Amino acid sequence: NALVEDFERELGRMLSPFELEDLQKTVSDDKTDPDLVRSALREAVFNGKTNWNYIQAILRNWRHEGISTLRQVEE
Ligand SMILES: [Zn+2]
Ligand SMILES: [Zn+2]
Ligand SMILES: [Zn+2]
Ligand SMILES: [Zn+2]
């Protein structure tokens, strides 16, 4: 999974089952574009804050504003 692979490379560690499951959920259940997830990861990297919770806070701030696809944030 390229996305998981992005996460593990930046995090420098494997995702836990819970994180793997959280990612599945956000993408399928919550219908979040994987490229939107990846751009939250990008933004955490660009901030020098590559940690799970920080990436999720970026995604939550975007979800609050009704943003679930990368086009909505701008491709
Ligand atoms: Zn990648
Ligand atoms: Zn969780
Ligand atoms: Zn959910
Ligand atoms: Zn993609």
What CATH number corresponds to the domain at position 60?
Answer: 1.10.10.630
Spell out the residues 6+ positions from residue 64 whose beta carbon is closer than 8 angstroms to its own. Answer: none
Within 10 A of 40 (CB to CB), how many other CB atoms are there?
A: 21
- Cβ atoms 49, 10 nearer than 8 A: no
**Taking ligand 1, which is a single-atom ion, which protein residues have CB atoms under 5 Å away?**
2, 6
Which method, experimentally, gave rise to this model? Answer: X-ray
Asked whether residue 30 is marked as a ligand-binding residue, the answer is yes
Question: Is residue 6 annotated as involved in ligand binding?
Answer: yes
What residues have CB less than 8 Å from 75, skipping those under 6 apart?
Answer: 35
**How many domains is the chain partitioned into structurally?**
1
Handedness of CA 20, 23, 25, 27 (dihedral sign): negative
What is the DSSP annotation of 22-42? HHHIIIIIT---HHHHHHHHH
Domain boundaries, position 50: 1-75
Neighbour tally for 47: CB within 10 Å = 10
- The C-alpha atoms of residue 17 and residue 73 are separated, in whole angstroms, by 29
